[PDB]
Design a protein around this nucleic acid. Structure first.
Ligand SMILES: [Mg+2]
Ligand SMILES: [Mg+2]
Ligand SMILES: [Mg+2]
Ligand SMILES: [Mg+2]
Ligand SMILES: [Mg+2]
Ligand SMILES: [Mg+2]
Ligand SMILES: [Mg+2]
Ligand SMILES: [Mg+2]
Ligand SMILES: [Mg+2]
Ligand SMILES: [Mg+2]
Ligand SMILES: [Mg+2]
Ligand SMILES: [Mg+2]
Ligand SMILES: [Mg+2]
Ligand SMILES: [Mg+2]
Ligand SMILES: [Mg+2]
Lengths: 50, 258, 65, 138, 181
RNA sequence: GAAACUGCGAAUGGCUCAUUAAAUCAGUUAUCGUUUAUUUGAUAGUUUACAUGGUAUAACUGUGGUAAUUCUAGAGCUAAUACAUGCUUAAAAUCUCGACCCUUUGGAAGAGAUGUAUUUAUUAGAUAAAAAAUCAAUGUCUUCGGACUCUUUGAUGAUUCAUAAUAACUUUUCGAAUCGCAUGGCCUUGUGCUGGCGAUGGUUCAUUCAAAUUUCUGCCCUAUCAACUUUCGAUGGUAGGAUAGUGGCCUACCAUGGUUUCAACGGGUAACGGGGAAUAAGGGUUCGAUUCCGGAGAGGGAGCCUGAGAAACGGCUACCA
């Protein structure tokens, strides 16, 4: 039977899914920035050694 | 046998639990969990045989079902949940926080901690590997999978994990001069500083550890856990500070304090 | 040149059926991995058909437009 | 002659693209076994195919490393070595000579005669009795 | 009935071992699936753990890969022509890994026509002119294309995965197997 | 809340020492050679919906058979976290096929495809250290001359490793049609939109309890047992089948190998192995079915369903008694 509890459960699942996706994207972006900064620093050090 | 075992005789149980050999015939078998069977302290033994809060297993079940016990900031209800090294046990009603650390004798010791120090734990990085979709992750000694680690973190390093978020706050590289804690073998519970790591390709690495009393001992690398820099531990250490004392000196100290 | 292929004499009657049946399968929402391979198979069989029949299949797609 | 057999001897998943025709020599894949076991140049520049070769095959050297004296080389691509040792009898406080014959897979990159000293490394079960593979000759 | 234990065999020295124990399930074996050309018949097998295996009792189509052009097309299997392990499989037309089979060339030929505009809109002309350099192929493959049946080698295990994938013989592979044929 | 369906357990525990002489077992290794219910931690915008069927039945009603059993036959009903189906959710990038203006250094509306799972083929997964000339394709830039820098890659002693990418394939999976408690927040006042605390499911990875195989060394008496194994696999190579997986485990073709007076092979064993027990001044000698660990069995052989886990026996089937 279609009852507001079922609608609430469906909506809750959809919201959980979207929120998880966004959080994963944010973590990926942060890691990309960290890797880029480390890479730039290492390249600068290599240039200094030359 | 035709399958996994589900019983544990008292005599076969780990020695360091300190179980009476005549109280019964069986001992708590720790369920599967973060820590290995032989290196874990089930909550029943901790609440009953160490803290003496519960008089028997049924009272322990009564405690757990009330949701008063938290392990690592999460409520557990299994009597035989395998709590182990560096796990934080919080009992809010008593306003008590404990960190499970081996004493010098090699047994889990009831160590009371402040709430702030209870906010985090330490984990030995057992593995560093790329997961699906090219996402690096680290597996620690307690089976925690943490994604997006700091790239400099390598195996055998230590990571300070915040329990609320399950993220790495800081990390310690395994290097000479670092403070380490022995978590296996006859030297279990001792604390010292690294002196040198012998490497043997295709074999077990050995690490030389010098104690504060300048005594030295060699231990397999699997049994070493980096806990901080010399004189600056990242956790509060139990009494004795991991110093092994001879039987004669123990007699002298015992007679003196008495 | 298949052994079970439609004979040239019988093509003219059968091919209009063959063109139309495949058209619906191209309209399957190309959404799941099995369903995506289905669409690729439908379009991949076009070269087997003679060019006039290929022209017929293209004509059907544009009829709705 | 390499291709002396009903099925073609090829290194799995090593593809020589005929169209490009960059080099005359067929592409050859090789690896170093580790533990400081130098891969011989014959393996690198050889033409043999062997799936049980430690340097060119799909077998890894892990576990114990042993040394022995070749005693038999009459079979194809394998040998039997002899490990001798002294067992201690405490009652008589004296030793006794004992020996064990170990079968070992030998890659064609090595040329072994009867009597020479070979060091071998453990690997996965190659055959009913073979669990070692030759890694140095001397 | 079929068991993979090493106990019933003789020792290395030649001694006749005694029966240590009754047979165990974790060391079992099952009947072979002599896959053959025909209308598709595949039945599942519940294996150790929750995993599943697919038994190709009958099959007539497989995906074959042209490695040089790096393509893979689905094609009916004409038959088995030569097998290294045993000729009886060749006589019976049984499909197993490494068996040499004949397959129709129509999808591959059509792909080559479309991609290179040669035989064995300006957009098409531009693409064809760009790719014209790689058009040339081996004469042996072209002769089979003219015949309409290409020689292919099965790289999959029909008795395990339920598939009949393979790749077109080429170069030394094709020369050697043609000599053996 | 009886009964029944569904899920889980019944493979733990308990008993005995028949068989078992490099077998078990002890110590010590390995899985880069594989399965793993469960626990723990991660992890899936890519898949009529105000929510689909009997392609269905139990319990139950009612009519019955047999001397008898935890025997059940016909008919009538009705459910799911059973069974079987099936949608709903951002943007961007990239790669193909490309109408059309146009012959350019071309451009280009549009039409497609991308998560996972399986199968296969191919590609990347760099490096001991420094400089140039050209052929082809061809991209950013300026001071139209030539110029073009910081350019991306983890782990192991070691890999075809982790991971990624390209082209296809699948009686082919998965991506919540499940349940409890409670009624907060936005307003265009609609039983409108949004929303909390939990349970149970689910792909893959890791951890844990485990499982399987496995490297080196070690067993009492017997030489009046000296040669054994190989036809019917014994040793090894190749290819395949099977296995969760390595492997003569089995098949087909090949060679003739493998062990042995440093005792193989055969025989006896009132032989389960060990931690241990007794005695002895020490060496030694004997005992260990028996409180713990490991192995095997359920009257004797043989063979299987289920399930993550059984060759189970307080599960089933034959034969022998
Ligand atoms: Mg190792
Ligand atoms: Mg005997
Ligand atoms: Mg042994
Ligand atoms: Mg359970
Ligand atoms: Mg889970
Ligand atoms: Mg009925
Ligand atoms: Mg044979
Ligand atoms: Mg094989
Ligand atoms: Mg007996
Ligand atoms: Mg005895
Ligand atoms: Mg005993
Ligand atoms: Mg049994
Ligand atoms: Mg009896
Ligand atoms: Mg039985
Ligand atoms: Mg029983």
């Amino acid at each position: 039977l279609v009852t507001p509890q079922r609608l609430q459960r469906k909506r809750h699942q959809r919201a959980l899914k979207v929120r998880n996706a966004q959080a994963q994207r944010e973590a990926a972006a942060e890691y990309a920035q960290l890797l880029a900064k480390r890479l730039s620093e290492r390249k600068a050090e290599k240039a200094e050694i030359r | 046998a035709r399958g996994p075992k589900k019983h544990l005789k008292r005599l076969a149980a780990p020695h360091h639990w300190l179980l009476d050999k005549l109280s019964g015939c069986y001992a708590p078998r720790p369920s599967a969990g973060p820590h290995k069977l032989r290196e874990s302290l089930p909550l029943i033994v901790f609440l009953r045989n160490r803290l003496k809060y519960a008089l028997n297993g049924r009272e322990v079940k009564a405690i757990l079902m009330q949701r008063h016990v938290k392990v690592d900031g999460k409520v557990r209800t299994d009597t035989t949940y395998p709590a182990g090294f560096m796990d934080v046990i919080t009992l809010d009603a008593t306003n008590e926080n404990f960190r499970l650390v081996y004493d010098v004798k090699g047994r889990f010791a009831v160590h009371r901690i402040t709430d702030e120090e209870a906010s985090y734990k330490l984990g030995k990085v057992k593995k560093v590997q790329l997961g699906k979709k090219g996402v690096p992750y680290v597996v620690t000694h307690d089976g925690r999978t943490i994604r997006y680690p700091d790239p400099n973190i390598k195996v055998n390093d230590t990571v300070k994990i915040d329990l609320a978020s399950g993220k790495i706050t800081d990390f310690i590289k395994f290097d000479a001069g670092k403070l380490v804690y022995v978590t296996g073998g006859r030297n279990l519970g001792r604390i010292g500083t690294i002196v040198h790591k012998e490497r043997h390709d295709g074999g077990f690495d050995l690490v030389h550890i010098k104690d504060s009393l300048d005594n030295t001992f060699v231990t397999r690398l699997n049994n070493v856990f980096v806990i901080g820099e010399q004189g600056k531990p990242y956790i509060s250490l139990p009494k004795g500070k991991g110093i092994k004392l001879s039987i004669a000196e123990e007699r002298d100290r015992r007679r003196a304090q008495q | 040149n298949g052994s079970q292929s439609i004979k040239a004499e019988d093509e003219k009657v059968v091919m209009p059926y063959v063109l139309r049946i495949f058209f619906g399968r191209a309209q399957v929402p190309p959404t799941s991995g099995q369903k995506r391979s289905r669409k690729i198979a439908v379009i991949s069989v076009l070269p087997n058909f003679k060019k006039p029949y290929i022209n017929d299949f293209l004509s059907l797609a544009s009829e709705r437009l | 002659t390499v291709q002396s057999e009903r099925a073609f001897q090829k290194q799995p998943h090593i593809f020589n693209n005929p169209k490009v025709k960059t080099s005359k020599r067929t592409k050859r894949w090789y690896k170093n076994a580790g533990l400081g076991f130098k891969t011989p140049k014959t393996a690198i520049e050889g033409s043999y195919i062997d799936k049980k070769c430690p340097f060119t095959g799909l077998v890894s050297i892990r576990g114990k490393i042993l040394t022995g004296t070749v005693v038999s080389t009459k079979m194809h691509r394998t040998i039997v070595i002899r490990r001798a040792y002294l067992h201690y009898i405490p009652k008589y406080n004296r030793y006794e000579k004992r020996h064990k014959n170990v079968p070992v897979h030998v890659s064609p990159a090595f040329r072994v005669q009867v009597g020479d000293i070979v060091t071998v490394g453990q690997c996965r079960p190659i055959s009913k009795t073979v669990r070692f593979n030759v890694v140095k000759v001397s | 009935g079929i068991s993979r234990d090493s106990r019933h065999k003789r020792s290395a020295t030649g001694a006749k071992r005694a029966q240590f124990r009754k047979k165990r399930k974790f060391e079992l074996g099952r009947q072979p699936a002599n896959t053959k050309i025909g209308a598709k018949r595949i039945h599942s097998v519940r294996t150790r753990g929750g995993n599943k295996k697919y038994r190709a009792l009958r099959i007539e189509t497989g995906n074959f890969s042209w490695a040089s052009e790096g393509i893979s097309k689905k094609t009916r299997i004409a038959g088995v022509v030569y097998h290294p392990s045993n000729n009886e499989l060749v006589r019976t037309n049984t499909l197993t890994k490494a068996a040499i089979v004949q397959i129709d060339a129509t999808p591959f030929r059509q792909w080559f026509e479309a991609h290179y505009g040669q035989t064995l809109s300006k957009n098409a002309e531009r693409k064809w002119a760009a790719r014209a350099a790689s058009a040339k192929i081996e004469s042996s493959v072209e002769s089979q294309f003219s015949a309409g049946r290409l020689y292919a080698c099965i790289s999959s295990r029909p008795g395990q995965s339920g598939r009949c994938d393979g790749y077109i013989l080429e170069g030394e592979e094709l020369a050697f197997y043609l000599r053996r044929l």
